[PDB]
Symmetry: C5
Amino acid sequence: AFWGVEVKPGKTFTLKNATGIRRLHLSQATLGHGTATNRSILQCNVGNKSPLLLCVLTPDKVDSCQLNLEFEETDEVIFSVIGPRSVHLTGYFL
Amino acid sequence: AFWGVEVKPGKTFTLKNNEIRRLHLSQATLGHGTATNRSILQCNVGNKSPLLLCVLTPDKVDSCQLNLEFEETDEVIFSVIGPRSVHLTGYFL
Amino acid sequence: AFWGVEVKPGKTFTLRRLHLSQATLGHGTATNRSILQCNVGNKSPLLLCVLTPDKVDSCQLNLEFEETDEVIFSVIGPRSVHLTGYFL
Amino acid sequence: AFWGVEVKPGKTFTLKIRRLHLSQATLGHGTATNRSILQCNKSPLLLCVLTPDKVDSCQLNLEFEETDEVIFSVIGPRSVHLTGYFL
Amino acid sequence: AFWGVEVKPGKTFTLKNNEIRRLHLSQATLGHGTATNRSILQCNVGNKSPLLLCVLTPDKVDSCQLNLEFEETDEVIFSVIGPRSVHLTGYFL
């Protein structure tokens, strides 16, 4: 059931499917290790639709936060991180 | 299925349930900008008196959980009062 | 499904299963805190949350009610509290 | 469905009705500035810490049954209002 | 239903399913101590690379919601990096 991935500052995670589609519950975003003080923003693109901000993590202030989103899509979902430090996404499949 | 929209400052998003789904609103995140004044997320199902959903303060409370649910015949109008947009995210069912 | 009410400082609201999701501090310039209180019948009052202006302006509750008994929400403090949630 | 109890700074609460969902802990009335800790009982586990004028309430979202040990205690100067609902 | 364990600093707790239940991890609370450095909750499944679950900072963020669920064939290794323990609480099913 458990699911998780570290999305890195220049890299992107894509969630695709393979005729069946699983439903993923994204629960938590946690700031990764680093010394940089600038914030990291978690961003999401479904297809070509404009990107949506999921959360903002500020080192030593808001180091992790709840998301509780759910994904069961026919289009690929692209998570990206803008900022100096990676974001650990954790959750579970339904 | 995933759902989301960026509500710009001083603008309105309208949720229609015409052609019928139940939306779970999960998260509100402050958008990009340099302004330090707060943004308030507002909701009105009807021309009714608006109810406050949450307050986002730059560099203090940049996002917050909502966990509201909508399944209405009337339109639902979300609005943002403040200098920076609010990204609403959630999911159907 | 959506449900909500603004409980004014000097006022009480009286209430199948309602999921109370969110409490948000209302407009005003007062800096004193507001406390959300709940009286279910002759029972002693229980505190649901505390909102402090410019510090804790809203918070999750995630409570549920379906009560043959009358539920009375009240706010002690200078500013109103917007309660939001949903049925079922 | 609604459920709640004020656990006083020096008193223990036990559950004695359905599958209980503990949702919220709120600091009770008082002027004391010292922290209050909510504890559960076997070595006891901390559920949350509430600090006056800093963290006055917080989410829990745990599930209990009377079949369980279920011994809640509060260590600190101010009581803790536990609120939630039965399943 | 209730479940919980204190993961001591630098130590490991193992969630083992065999003989199979679904555990809902709800809450992480910082344990007793005077150290001001942060504690990080970490999760491994088998020999894969560890994922960060949450960060607890003394006197700032002393506890936080997790709402993770586990129902795996392999052991789950929780670990704490930092000076103070982390009390994990949750429930089965």
